[PDB]
From a paper:
The membrane-anchored SNARE (soluble N-ethylmaleimide-sensitive factor acceptor protein receptor) proteins provide the energy to drive membrane fusion in various cellular contexts, such as intracellular trafficking and exocytosis. Supercomplexes of NSF, α-SNAP, and either a syntaxin tetramer or one of two binary complexes of syntaxin—SNAP-25 reveal atomic details of SNARE processing and show how sequential ATP hydrolysis drives disassembly. NSF comprises three structured domains connected by flexible linkers—the adapter N-domain followed by the D1 and D2 AAA+ domains. Six NSF protomers come together to form the active form of the enzyme, a homo-hexamer.
To improve the resolution of the spire reconstruction, signal subtraction and local alignment were performed as before. This approach improved the reconstruction of the spire proteins to 4.22 Å, enabling docking of a crystal structure of the 2:2 syntaxin—SNAP-25 SN1 complex into the density, which was of sufficient quality to assign characteristic side chains, to identify the SNARE domains, and to determine their directionality. Furthermore, we were able to reproduce this result by reconstituting the complex with only the SNARE domains of syntaxin and SNAP-25 under non-hydrolyzing conditions (min22bin20S), yielding the same spire configuration but to a higher resolution of 3.86 Å following local reconstruction. This reconstruction also reveals the interface between an N-domain of NSF and an ɑ-SNAP molecule in detail; the interface is characterized by a core hydrophobic interaction surrounded by charge complementation. Four ɑ-SNAP molecules bind the 2:2 binary SNARE complex, with two SNAP-25 SN1 SNARE domains and two syntaxin H3 domains. Regardless, these structures are consistent with the notion that SNAP-25 SN1 is a critical initial mediator of SNARE assembly.
Numbering used by the authors:
A (entry chain B), B (entry chain D): 191 to 258
C (entry chain J), D (entry chain K): 1 to 154, 171 to 201
E (entry chain C): 19 to 82
F (entry chain A): 19 to 83
G (entry chain F), I (entry chain E): 0 to 25, 34 to 287
H (entry chain G): 0 to 24, 34 to 289
J (entry chain H): 0 to 26, 35 to 291
The structure:
Amino acid sequence: ALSEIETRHSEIIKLENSIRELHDMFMDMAMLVESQGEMIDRIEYNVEHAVDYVERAVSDTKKAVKYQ
Amino acid sequence: ALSEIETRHSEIIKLENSIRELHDMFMDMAMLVESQGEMIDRIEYNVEHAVDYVERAVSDTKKAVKYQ
Amino acid sequence: MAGRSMQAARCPTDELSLSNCAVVSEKDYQSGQHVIVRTSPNHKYIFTLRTHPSVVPGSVAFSLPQRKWAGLSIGQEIEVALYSFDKAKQCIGTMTIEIDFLQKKNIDSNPYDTDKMAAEFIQQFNNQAFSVGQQLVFSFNDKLFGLLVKDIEAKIEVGLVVGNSQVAFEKAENSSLNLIGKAKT
Amino acid sequence: MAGRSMQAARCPTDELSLSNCAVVSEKDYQSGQHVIVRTSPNHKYIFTLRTHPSVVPGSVAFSLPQRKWAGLSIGQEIEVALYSFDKAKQCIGTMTIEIDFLQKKNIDSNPYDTDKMAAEFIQQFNNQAFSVGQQLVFSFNDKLFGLLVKDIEAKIEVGLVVGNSQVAFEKAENSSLNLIGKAKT
Amino acid sequence: DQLADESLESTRRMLQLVEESKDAGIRTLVMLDEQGEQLERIEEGMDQINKDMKEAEKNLTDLG
Amino acid sequence: DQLADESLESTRRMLQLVEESKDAGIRTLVMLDEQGEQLERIEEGMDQINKDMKEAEKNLTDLGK
Amino acid sequence: GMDTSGKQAEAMALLAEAERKVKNSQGSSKIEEACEIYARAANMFKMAKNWSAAGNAFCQAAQLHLQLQSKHDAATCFVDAGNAFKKADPQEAINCLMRAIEIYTDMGRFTIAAKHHISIAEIYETELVDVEKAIAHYEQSADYYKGEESNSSANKCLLKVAGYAAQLEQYQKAIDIYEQVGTSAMDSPLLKYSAKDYFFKAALCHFCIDMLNAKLAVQKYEELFPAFSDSRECKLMKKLLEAHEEQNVDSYTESVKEYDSISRLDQWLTTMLLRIKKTI
Amino acid sequence: GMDTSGKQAEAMALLAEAERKVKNSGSSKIEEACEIYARAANMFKMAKNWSAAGNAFCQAAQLHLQLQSKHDAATCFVDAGNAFKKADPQEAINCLMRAIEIYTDMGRFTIAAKHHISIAEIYETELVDVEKAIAHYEQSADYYKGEESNSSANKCLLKVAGYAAQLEQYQKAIDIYEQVGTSAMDSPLLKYSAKDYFFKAALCHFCIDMLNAKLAVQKYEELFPAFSDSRECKLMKKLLEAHEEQNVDSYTESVKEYDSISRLDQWLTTMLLRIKKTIQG
Amino acid sequence: GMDTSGKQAEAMALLAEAERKVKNSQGSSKIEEACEIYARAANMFKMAKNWSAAGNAFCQAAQLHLQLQSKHDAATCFVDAGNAFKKADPQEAINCLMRAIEIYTDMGRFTIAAKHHISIAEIYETELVDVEKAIAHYEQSADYYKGEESNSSANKCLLKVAGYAAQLEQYQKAIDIYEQVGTSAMDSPLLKYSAKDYFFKAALCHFCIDMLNAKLAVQKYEELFPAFSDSRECKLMKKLLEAHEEQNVDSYTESVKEYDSISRLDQWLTTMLLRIKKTI
Amino acid sequence: GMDTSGKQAEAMALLAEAERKVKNSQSSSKIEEACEIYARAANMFKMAKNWSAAGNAFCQAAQLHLQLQSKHDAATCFVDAGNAFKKADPQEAINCLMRAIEIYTDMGRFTIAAKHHISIAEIYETELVDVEKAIAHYEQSADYYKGEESNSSANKCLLKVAGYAAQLEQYQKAIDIYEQVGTSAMDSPLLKYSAKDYFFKAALCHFCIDMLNAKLAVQKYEELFPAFSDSRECKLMKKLLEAHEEQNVDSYTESVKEYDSISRLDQWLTTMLLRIKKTIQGDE
């Protein structure tokens, strides 16, 4: 037993504890990544709207004012 | 005897290989996350610049056409 | 007979819990009546009612064995309708009941009068309905026994026990109970 | 000479590498001169020059022992300044050299005449500059050995060898050399 | 022996846990790649927006 | 007997690897938190600019017509 | 009631005012004002959780914007109407999203069409329990995404298409898609570790046609790059093949159970393994 | 550098100028006055005072309100709320509520949801009114769910469920926990987490009566098979067996053994103590 | 149904009428309408899977739009034409992308010229099998990025440049770049963990020139970065140096195989080790 | 072409043209053209690798924008000039960044001022090694970030300033900072796991003052945070405390050596442990 048994048990238990902590960390990380993905998705649309609005407005107003 | 003996010698190498693979995955993930962080910083700067210029121009046209 | 929506509750007091019956409010029924309780289309069970001075109207209380047999959850909705038993064709003459100790605390090898116990059964359980597979508790000289209905003789699925019915006991497998009496086989 | 910048190159041939004399270009100097190669501000090592055809002028070729002693890498910048010996104090009378096997493959238990090799040493590098701490190779009969200068007796750090050098050799650090003769201690 | 049986069971649990962690890591990597592509698109759109707006100010200020 | 010693060495190497992985995980978590805050800060800017542009456009249009 | 009743009352009032103004106009400012109040009424409906009326109002505003010479606003109103209708009756949601997709693709924007096609396919699969049209929509979305060199989205859509097609007994298409994705993802240093999965699935499909195809394909895949020869999955494949060669089903069941014990199986894998077992 | 004295003096000068400008009241006067109010508020926020900044922002918001502009009033109200965040909670609540009222009129639902979550954090961190926190979280969850943002409408529901479990309303917590577990089960990414919620549901059941816990555990194992091979299900089975014979030593032994490998937060320990005291008797 | 018959017919009709309208102009509204029609026709052709027509239409629109004072739109059309042409004939894509890059840099926007250079480099390497111009483009992009303190992207570009330069037997450049990147990454909280790898690579290059240089460089990097003294790579380097010091190829191969077993070597490492072993 | 000579010559000619054009103008409408030509000259210089002239041109453009009634453009030109000068003349970079910070904070925007303050502190620490000014700038940035409800950035800045303060033998200041962050990290779902580390560092600072303050602080953290008890750092601290009490320098050295062998330490930890070692050795 002696060193053999003591190393066996202690190292095994410590390894298991560390593995469990890693498990928890990764679950939380994945949830955070999901939420951020949805925020990015919502930003994209509001950027496209603004692009179309500005382009159309500038074009039309320029034409109208030059014609006047 | 040698049954349970060869078992550990083959229950250890699997763990070694899996752990090394996890190591490589995490290194690549960290590099990617850093690059995305810098991209986000640039996007924020551009957004703030654009919003402030838009406000200036809109207020300018508003007062200019108010005084006509 | 038409059926109403009633709610399962916890049986009041221990004595009513050892007195096998579904407990109801004094405003609706009395004791000795027969009802069928439906929790789903495919499993319905017949019970006899008893009134208690604590039952809240709109609920029916059951003891632990009845809930463990019928698979009922406290607070779940069930339907109960009065049921009318024939007496000319379903009357039980003799039954087979498997018996064992209810409380593991004190197993013993002493002899138990299976005859006297059977008579006490009639004393306590006369005029109550029993079905195959139903589980119950039996109080005999301050001892708790678990009983399981094995067979019924007039074969009938449900019947009304009469005063002169005879009960036979047989030790459950993997038990040290030494039974000695007429109620054996 | 003045300390101009040179570059270390590879020994042109094996024979010149074994000669223990730094190969140089025929256009720059004449054989027999000495140069205290200056690398770091606190690192200068004395080497003797010998010309050989080929080699591009402006570089100095060294054998593996020289590069491993002075710690030079091919392509590195070095300073070459000429050196003058002080015959009144630098003249080497005796020198102490530690000897050991160079190649573990050729280990053998045969006897080694310590005196017979000594004369060959004189025959080889007579009149050539040697410095304390220098490492070199020794070509005994079909034997490649590693030599390390530990001490010099007329103590000086650098001197010019002569023909009266009775170098006593002694094995060290688990060496298997079977040494015979009177040229030991 | 029997304590080595405990240890064999321990190794088995370790192996299962590491496999699960590996799957989670792989999925996270894929998710990050997709997000990176979306970030690229947003950045590309932004610049256009900025320039198109500054042109308008200039032309209409020259007009006024 | 001496091949068991190898087990000990393997176990020590595994433990070191696990510690390194844990530290990497901590750093990744912190970085993700900061990035999330930045994304939140950007959403609001986008909203405000969109609103302002729309309003001003309607204003110009009506004014003219 | 409380908020619900008053919000309903104001919504009906706004609808009545809109009808009054449209019948009055039958100018341009009248139509603009009517569309504005239509939108406000729809928003007020959404507060009280009455989705049908919200969709009706949004579609009416979309039509009003259509008759007037404006398009993007019509697209926005149509897509919002579809999203609102996603609760009660999916058919109208499909119709509205189709109109929005047509309008968007006309102008030359191909990113948003992919999103709307994906949403339509999700509705089709989840509510109408029909998979052919899901396949069509996913393929269209994959094509649009790949058009702009956004590879990852194309890969995701094609993986879904391949899974559904393989479920429906059309194997060759699934094999082609799996080969393409597996070989493409192998090169990239990031996704290198997942490729071993895709090849595995391809092999299973080959094994549903005939054993010899499975053996040849396994050999070819192992040749294509050696990491796939890791004992983990290739061992299982070889054992399954050998068990099927000698008409021994007990060994097959034992091997599958042993692999299952260490790691649970998914419905897809269990179904495919059951078919392979049966044919034996 | 300049110290709060000079900044406060300049802020007071700006406030006096704005007040006199509004006194002689036209559009130019009011616009200039609101501009001065904004500048003074910024200077105050630089001065580290936190109440005069709120007052300035609120006055500017009221001026923008009386003039026919809305968006600007909302922005000034939210800024005033952020300023009061540290000065006085109740004024912050009022300002944020008015901002949400203005926002929700024009259909900007997500912003209203965020502001609701902020009012809720206020009510739960400094004030002790949990009921209002539950109401606000429910409203935010509904607003998010209305836009198909399922991924951000599941945090508010979990917080609501936890607070309702603390209050002893167990049916609501059970319903929410099950629903969320069933929703997350299907998605491949979130699957690994689902195991938690089901466990947390069973405990709630076990608070009412043991038999309900037995039946619920059976139902969840049938519905979802991986649950049957985790460690939480082992502990549940062990406790349900142990507490059927009034044997508290086994109960505490199992709890301590589980605690050793992994520590338990406050919620779990409170629930376990409730269960032991109530039922094990 | 998305058949290309009607799509092609419409596209050709639009192109023909645009050519007619532009031809009649022997004031500038004709150019504007013609350019808009050209853009619509290009999008139509792109829908039709015919990419060459899309490229031609886009380039014509770009030319016509650049004819006017407006230039910010020529850039955009040119980049779009390049994306389109990236399928059939890469040579034109290079020309268009370069004409774009030129305008962008002239305007003062440097961050969005590096991206186009990276794209051109990818085209060159993947299809034209030429590496000198790839190196040139990567170097230029790295310079532009490092101008704007975007260190990470500059590091990635320099890594690719160093890899190819080492591939082409220009060792000195590779070693300089690798040591620069290693030292820079050593001083960071996150990248720290990867910092070992680069050093290992550098050591290998030092080996190709001469063994002793490699020995001294390993000593230097171990002293500079103590955590490097325990990693696997340093141990492997020590063993290979000792094996190569005594004309012992056997132990060299044994160590290489032992290190291969745990982790699979890439093409780069295996080719470099093969060169080293071919030396002796 | 890539030729630098032609590009620089063109830049010089264009800059001279702009100079003479503005000088003629001085003899508003033309000032705009002067600004645009200055910006083009600056960009050309930047592409010509002559960073000094690029910074100078940007500064001139900013000055031209200031006299005209525009500010935001002046701020943008100042920040560009600072980024350009960063490589050659750090002092002018700091000057330009400070002016831009003043303008920005005057206009109302705050976070941008925090970013520029962080940049100024970074340049101070990397080039002129003036630690006190770096501490001042970091504290100002943290104040702004915390005033705008952004917590993570404020925490990062506070950690940096605390590290330098401990470096400069101002122990008390560092300790409070660490404790604050620790409590915050205790009340979070994610950061919880790292929260021990901060506590550990705080303990070491106490040990520098007195060993009994350190023991009491360890007890306080133990009762406040029980998870801290299992971790290695608590065991190491208790063993070191005992060894210091008993005066057996050898046990302290051996224990620290073993802990180092298991894992390496940063310069900060090694120097702090060395200071404690030197303190204890005098006792023996």
